[PDB]
Design a protein around this ligand. Structure first.
Ligand code: CA
Length: 187
């Protein structure tokens, strides 16, 4: 095959296709594409069913040509056959993804074209005991900032002395900064 290795993708949106797409991919391909987003994002892969045609699996269900996505410990695929067999949207749960495409000596098809985007990872909303959150949202994600205001008769301890409100940021690790700070009754 050709050189289809070494490319690194770091933008929050991107598009990748097998060599020569939509003309037949090369035999004996060993392609690898690396997506590298900053911590706090997951790579989400979108691949339309009809944008994928790869040599069919053998009798034993094994892929001779294959597309595989590697995200840390997790693997998606191997995929082969006529039409993409996986979900239209794949949340890999990782900021780093390796896309690996290998082909054998015979039997080539049009190949594949995929897109990806970075999806900011969520920070779960705590139960707001004696406080209200601003803004109120169904989902908070990486870099969101909220103001947490204590109800009347409550205050923040461990923050400033005598605070009745504070801010908190959804961090790259899925946790709120200032998660130690709680609204508690006035003494
Ligand atoms: Ca083949």
């Amino acid at each position: 095959g050709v050189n289809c290795s070494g490319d690194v993708f770091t933008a929050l949106i991107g598009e990748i296709a097998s060599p020569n797409y939509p003309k037949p991919y090369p035999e004996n391909s060993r392609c690898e594409y690396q997506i590298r987003l900053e911590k706090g994002f997951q790579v989400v892969v979108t691949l339309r069913r009809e944008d994928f045609d790869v040599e069919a699996a053998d009798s034993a269900g094994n892929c001779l040509d294959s597309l595989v996505f590697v995200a840390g410990d997790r693997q998606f695929g191997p995929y082969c056959g006529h039409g993409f067999p996986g979900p239209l949207n794949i949340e890999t749960k990782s900021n780093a993804l390796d896309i690996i495409f290998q082909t054998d000596l015979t039997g080539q098809k049009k190949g594949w074209k995929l897109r990806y985007h970075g999806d900011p990872m969520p920070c779960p909303k705590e139960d707001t005991p004696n406080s209200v959150w601003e803004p109120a949202k169904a989902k908070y994600v990486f870099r969101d900032v909220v103001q947490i205001t204590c109800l009347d008769g409550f205050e923040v301890v461990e923050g400033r002395v005598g605070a009745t409100s504070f801010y908190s940021t959804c961090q790259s690790n899925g946790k709120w900064s200032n998660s130690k700070l709680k609204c508690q009754p006035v003494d």
